[PDB]
């Protein structure tokens, strides 16, 4: 007439298969995923301010596409690149684009102060039908192309200053004209040979126009080149030029924050979601992803592996 | 397991108990029962909650560099490349190892519950009992509900039974 | 602790034990008294020095390297070098935090380990003399003065002596007229 | 070991077992005995294959890469270069390090742990018929002749055939 | 009369020393080595193509350099460049050099398409005695010195177009000359300073010609400079030079693969393996090596150890 | 009749908290901390050289600004920068900046030995108000400015040459000059425009002056272009212009080594320390460190977590 006391853990009727040290797979009463490998197809307009480009890029959001008109004085979080974006201007290059496009994705703001240039000597709002405004010719909105006097056929050595008395940097984008023939160069600015000169008390840059004949872009084999000029308080910006100068019309304002920009062809959609990748926003609840490497936002950790799992129970040891 | 009870001298586990982790099943004159050992299993879900709460624990990152690219460019983006794949593989590991250290470390800790609340019981039942070697007291004396009960809160007073037990045990 | 001796069936530690990590109070015929064990002691923490040698042990030097603050704005190239120096910190943000949390769960396990192995060391050493009370106390069954308790504490102490005396204040038995042995 | 019994109350390994990682020594009315135990044998070196095979497994491969030697001093992107990669060497040489160690201390562990497990094994076989002499080894209060031996290395072993005549072996007690 | 039974485990009459989280050295029965420390010192030619440079640069056997020409139409998972290596042809630098290596490199193939490119006004195929092709005057395969037509005084404006009908990118070298005194430059290409400009729809590079001295090679004081251009699906080439073009004859086919270079003096052998250093293969058993940190293929990964010692025994205990 | 021996641990009134796998806080009897968080503000002059650029960057002690004079040949471990540091000579840039003070920084010297240039046909030692030497005209120590000759109102292709027979690394710092007006051009160097080619046997450097107005920037509007040139043992310069060459008056030895360079207003002191921060120097005994993620020589990693607590003692419960 005695008593039996037993000693037992619990079991499940079927559990999960883990990895240890020493097993591959081991079965445990429970675990839990430790890597997100799914996202909702779209990105989230909160909390982050995201900025859809649609069929513009940021570049040409910056310099003033007219069909990119609309992005004027925009600000972001995100700024969202689609693929089906396409420049409608005149035809151009940016040397060392990606660092444009970086330092101004960083920046958060295309906010523009136009500012009193003042180009004696010269015709202005030089346009073409290569970038078409209202019922004729156009240009980008943010430069001036500058072209000889109406009478006199003269073209002077421009000459301006600007002085840079904020307590910000300025940020000013200009440009030099490259003409496909001699002819176009001397009928527009006269001298056979142009120069763009832009200094501050820091630093100084010359370009020199190249004439000559590029791909067939809307009706031109000319080129324009883009370049940019920081300014610091205090300091003050100098424009000499005798031909072919893509004149500023002011400057961006620049900032600092968490801004930047994104390649997506994820619809925006009305949510929240502190985390944005290519695909759409992805739940950050989990430290680890496999969704994608590119990614915006408070993001779990991308990895390779697409799952993995972490007990939370005992060993499994059924019956 | 590195303690040997869980998948050791206890031989399986119990489905029917749905409300611990950790139990006790009984038999004696009054018939058979079951109950949770709710400290042992707080112990084991404590330890196991903490570990999620530190991992699941939530980096934010902004402005970044580029990782895919339209245009072959060569040194520049030779490195960029370079600099993320070498990122990659290096969380990648961390996370593995991760995982695999930490299930490891589980598995070992729900075993030492559950050896220690063998152990626990043993030293409560003193003289009164014999450990039959698949985690079973036989226990040498009557022991009715109330008595099983008091064995279950750490209240069974050993020096009542020891007579009767010392006597069933030196036998024949 | 994996172990289940400190936090465990040992209630608590001892503030007055001030020369040793580990050790015995007692009670006998003549009173109370306490002492270190010194090789469990030692054994903790040789492997606790060993542990902390590792960790700092200086492993890091470098001179030239990239730069980590910029005074302008460039783009691309300072992108990078900020994104290089950025992914290093956070990954040895992580080596750093995941070592010590680490360490420390083992650290507080070999400790505990290190107990119970005193524990069960004595429990052998006593054999039939005594038993488990179950919180850290063996009870003895014969008379132990001072030299009796000090045998146990370095190991000398023979079990056969007291055998019998032991055994036989153990299971005296009330109900059947087996009390003490009273042959000569 | 946190458990104990390598390097601890067993007070040695035997060099002449050589059939085996954990096993037992006899001595009985018909002499002396060594055999090797098989679970807990193949149990300490299932676990340790396992991570063996899990560490030297095979998951590196790359192709195109940085240059990581140069002829020329060049200044700023070669800098950024070499600390990339130096970044990366340091890493994984730690990463490396740690690895070895955190195993080589879970491996003398769990084959302290799979010796002492096999101990309390065979000491729950034993019930009260053996006492623990504290030194990994049981003595014995009955007649265990070579088939009572080979039924506690087998498992067998049944203490209530034995317990009348080790029970009054165990408490046979002397007066002054 | 009774028995004892002892439980106990092995050990071995020599041991192996290992580290731990508590020890720096402790002897278990065994371990194993995972550090990958030695190479046969050669490069195994299976099952990686390995193309072996010998006195050619990939650069010079890009650019035709005549003693190179048995590299024509060459493909390679891994080229070898020896320092052995040495050019033997018109002296010339190459702008970013070390991403013209890279980006051949990466393609795997030195595959050329000859294209009509039609020099109007111009003579075509220009030699010179510090590029022999045997006994005589010669030049790089791939490259074509346009001079002035062999009437007096006349280098026209160059102005040629080849466009991309195909579905895979174009690679295109060309070059800029840079005549030694200016004798040489307008008997060669009769204007005072030449001009190149190669472009594409988003891309243009002008490179303007410097005359001067520089150092003596292979009996020129003169140089060439060479440049790329990558001509995607539907773009299309334009080159408009008014002298000092060294023209492309055609392109080379650009591909996407597991193909690099090395620089190593190991020689090749009939062999297996799938890692590749400098030093010749190393086998990858092991997680690491110590080897090299420039690999190729399924390599141990590199670290600063040159051993490693993995317990694959329980801890030693003799007496 | 009996005994009763009891086995313990120790524990002590208040310990340390600590984190584990399991616990975020847990207290333990003693514990270490693993990351040095703080610095006694000052640089120690020892073991490392370090040289205090004072009023002068790197780049004006190279180019020989007048008043960096004093740095001529100097030698360090490390170059320190200070915030108060000023140009006070030709105004000037640097193409790839970062790179010329990288490399001059690691290199660890401004060891210069002159070298037997021969200008024929030209004037040589062309100074500016802007740099003014005492109370006369000056210019960078290692540098030659080069005009048109003093009566012929000529300025020549220069073309000389000098080769590298030592067996060790040359490093040639020239200029273009950029003037503001045309007459400025022609009148200091007879051409309308200038050329500069500078080569060894494998590689070449050509520039083109600018000509335009600036901002003023001491007194002028005008600029100076510096470039660098490493001639290798064996190899040769060249120097083809025919206008505008800021000349070099010889060669930098070249050095490798354990130098470089730091920006700091940390001021150095008297004592001994392996490991340099902008903001001081650190003790090494720690493994990590969260003063800054620049330093210099033997030093803890830096890690975001200003303090971790290593576990030394067991856990306490008292
Ligand atoms: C240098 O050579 C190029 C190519 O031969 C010349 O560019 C060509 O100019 C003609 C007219 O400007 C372009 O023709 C047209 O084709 C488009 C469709 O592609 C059509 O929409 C137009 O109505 C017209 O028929 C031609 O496309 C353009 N070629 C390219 C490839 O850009 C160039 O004119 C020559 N340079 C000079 C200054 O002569
Ligand atoms: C500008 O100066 C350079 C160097 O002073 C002149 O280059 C020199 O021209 C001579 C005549 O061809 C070269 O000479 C020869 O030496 C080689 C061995 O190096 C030998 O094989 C030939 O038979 C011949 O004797 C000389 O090496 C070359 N020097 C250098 C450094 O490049 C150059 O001619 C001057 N330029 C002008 C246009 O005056
Ligand atoms: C192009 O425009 C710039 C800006 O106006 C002109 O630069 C200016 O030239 C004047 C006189 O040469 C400089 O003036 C003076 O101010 C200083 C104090 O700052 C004073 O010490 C002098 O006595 C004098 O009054 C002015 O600073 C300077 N501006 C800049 C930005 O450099 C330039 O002359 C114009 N260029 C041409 C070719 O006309
Ligand atoms: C997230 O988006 C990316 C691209 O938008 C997807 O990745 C591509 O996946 C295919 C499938 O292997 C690859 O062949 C491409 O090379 C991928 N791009 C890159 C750069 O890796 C990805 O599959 C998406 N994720 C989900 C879950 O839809
Ligand atoms: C593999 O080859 C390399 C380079 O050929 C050897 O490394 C050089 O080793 C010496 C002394 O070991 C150093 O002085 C050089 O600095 C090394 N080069 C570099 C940049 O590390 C190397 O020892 C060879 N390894 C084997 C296993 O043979
Ligand atoms: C070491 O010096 C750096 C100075 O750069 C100090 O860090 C700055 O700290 C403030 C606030 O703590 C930040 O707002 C700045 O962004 C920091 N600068 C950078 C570049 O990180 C730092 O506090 C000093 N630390 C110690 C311990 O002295
Ligand atoms: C942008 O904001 C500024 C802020 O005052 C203002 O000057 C300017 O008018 C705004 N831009 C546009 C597009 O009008
Ligand atoms: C499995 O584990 C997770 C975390 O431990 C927990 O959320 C969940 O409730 C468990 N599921 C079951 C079956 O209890
Ligand atoms: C040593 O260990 C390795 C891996 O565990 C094994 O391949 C080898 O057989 C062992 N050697 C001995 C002496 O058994
Ligand atoms: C600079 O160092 C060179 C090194 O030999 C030496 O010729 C020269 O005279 C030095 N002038 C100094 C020490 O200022």
Redesign the interface.
């Given at each position: 007439?005695?008593?039996?006391?037993?000693?037992?853990?619990?079991?499940?009727?079927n559990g999960t298969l883990?990895?240890?040290?020493?097993?591959?797979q081991?079965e445990?009463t429970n675990a839990?995923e430790?890597?997100q490998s799914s996202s909702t197809g779209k990105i989230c307009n909160n909390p982050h301010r995201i900025l859809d480009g649609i069929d513009c890029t940021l570049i040409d959001a910056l310099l003033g596409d007219p069909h990119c008109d609309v992005f004027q004085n925009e600000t972001w979080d995100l700024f969202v690149e689609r693929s089906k974006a396409f420049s409608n201007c005149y035809?151009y290059?940016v040397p060392?684009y990606?660092?444009?496009r970086?330092?101004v994705?960083?920046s958060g703001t295309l906010e523009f102060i136009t500012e009193g240039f003042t180009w004696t000597g010269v015709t202005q709002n030089g346009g073409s039908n290569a970038c078409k405004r209202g019922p004729g010719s156009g240009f980008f909105s943010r430069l001036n192309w500058l072209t000889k006097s109406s009478k006199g056929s003269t073209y002077p050595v421009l000459?301006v200053?600007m002085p840079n008395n904020d307590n910000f940097?300025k940020l000013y984008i200009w440009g030099v004209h490259?003409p496909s023939t001699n002819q176009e160069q001397t009928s527009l600015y006269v001298q056979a040979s142009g120069?763009v000169?832009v200094?501050?008390?820091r630093?100084?840059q010359?370009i020199?126009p190249?004439i000559?004949?590029?791909?067939w872009?809307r009706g031109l084999s000319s080129?324009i080149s883009i370049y940019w000029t920081?300014v610091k308080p205090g300091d003050?910006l100098?424009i000499?030029s005798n031909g072919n100068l893509i004149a500023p019309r002011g400057y961006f304002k620049?900032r600092t924050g968490?801004?930047?920009?994104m390649?997506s062809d994820a619809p925006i959609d009305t949510c929240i979601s502190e985390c944005i990748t290519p695909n759409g926003s992805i739940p950050?609840?989990?430290?680890?992803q496999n969704v994608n490497?590119?990614?915006?936002?408070?993001?779990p950790?991308?990895?390779?592996?697409n799952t993995?799992?972490?007990?939370?129970?005992?060993?499994?040891?059924?019956? | 397991?590195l303690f040997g009870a869980?998948?050791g001298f206890?031989?399986?586990?119990?489905?029917g108990?749905?409300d611990?982790?950790?139990?006790?099943?009984?038999?004696?004159?009054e018939g058979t029962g079951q109950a949770a050992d709710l400290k042992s299993t707080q112990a084991?879900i404590d330890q196991?909650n903490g570990k999620?709460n530190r991992?699941?624990?939530?980096?934010?990152?902004?402005?970044?560099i580029?990782?895919?690219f339209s245009e072959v460019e060569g040194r520049i983006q030779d490195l960029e490349k370079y600099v993320?794949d070498t990122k990659?593989?290096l969380?990648?590991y961390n996370?593995?190892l991760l995982?695999?250290?930490?299930?490891?470390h589980?598995?070992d800790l729900?075993?030492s519950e559950?050896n220690k609340?063998?152990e626990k019981?043993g030293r409560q039942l003193r003289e009164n009992?014999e450990d039959?070697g698949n985690?079973?007291?036989?226990?040498?004396?009557?022991?009715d509900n109330a008595?099983?009960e008091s064995?279950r809160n750490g209240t069974y007073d050993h020096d009542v039974y020891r007579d009767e037990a010392l006597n069933?045990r030196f036998q024949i």
């Amino acid at each position: 007439p005695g008593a039996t006391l037993c000693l037992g853990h619990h079991a499940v009727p079927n559990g999960t298969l883990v990895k240890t040290i020493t097993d591959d797979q081991i079965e445990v009463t429970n675990a839990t995923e430790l890597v997100q490998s799914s996202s909702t197809g779209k990105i989230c307009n909160n909390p982050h301010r995201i900025l859809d480009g649609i069929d513009c890029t940021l570049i040409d959001a910056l310099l003033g596409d007219p069909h990119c008109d609309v992005f004027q004085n925009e600000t972001w979080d995100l700024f969202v690149e689609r693929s089906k974006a396409f420049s409608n201007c005149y035809p151009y290059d940016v040397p060392d684009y990606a660092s444009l496009r970086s330092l101004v994705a960083s920046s958060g703001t295309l906010e523009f102060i136009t500012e009193g240039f003042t180009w004696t000597g010269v015709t202005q709002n030089g346009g073409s039908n290569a970038c078409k405004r209202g019922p004729g010719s156009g240009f980008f909105s943010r430069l001036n192309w500058l072209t000889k006097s109406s009478k006199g056929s003269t073209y002077p050595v421009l000459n301006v200053t600007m002085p840079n008395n904020d307590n910000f940097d300025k940020l000013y984008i200009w440009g030099v004209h490259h003409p496909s023939t001699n002819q176009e160069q001397t009928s527009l600015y006269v001298q056979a040979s142009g120069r763009v000169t832009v200094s501050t008390r820091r630093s100084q840059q010359t370009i020199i126009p190249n004439i000559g004949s590029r791909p067939w872009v809307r009706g031109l084999s000319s080129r324009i080149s883009i370049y940019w000029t920081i300014v610091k308080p205090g300091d003050v910006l100098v424009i000499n030029s005798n031909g072919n100068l893509i004149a500023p019309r002011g400057y961006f304002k620049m900032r600092t924050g968490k801004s930047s920009i994104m390649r997506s062809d994820a619809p925006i959609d009305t949510c929240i979601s502190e985390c944005i990748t290519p695909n759409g926003s992805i739940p950050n609840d989990k430290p680890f992803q496999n969704v994608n490497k590119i990614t915006y936002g408070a993001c779990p950790k991308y990895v390779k592996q697409n799952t993995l799992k972490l007990a939370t129970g005992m060993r499994n040891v059924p019956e | 397991g590195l303690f040997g009870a869980i998948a050791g001298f206890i031989e399986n586990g119990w489905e029917g108990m749905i409300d611990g982790w950790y139990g006790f099943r009984h038999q004696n004159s009054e018939g058979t029962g079951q109950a949770a050992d709710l400290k042992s299993t707080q112990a084991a879900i404590d330890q196991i909650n903490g570990k999620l709460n530190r991992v699941i624990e939530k980096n934010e990152k902004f402005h970044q560099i580029e990782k895919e690219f339209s245009e072959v460019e060569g040194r520049i983006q030779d490195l960029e490349k370079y600099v993320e794949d070498t990122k990659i593989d290096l969380w990648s590991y961390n996370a593995e190892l991760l995982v695999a250290l930490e299930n490891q470390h589980t598995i070992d800790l729900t075993d030492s519950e559950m050896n220690k609340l063998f152990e626990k019981t043993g030293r409560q039942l003193r003289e009164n009992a014999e450990d039959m070697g698949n985690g079973c007291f036989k226990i040498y004396h009557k022991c009715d509900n109330a008595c099983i009960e008091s064995i279950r809160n750490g209240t069974y007073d050993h020096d009542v039974y020891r007579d009767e037990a010392l006597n069933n045990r030196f036998q024949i």
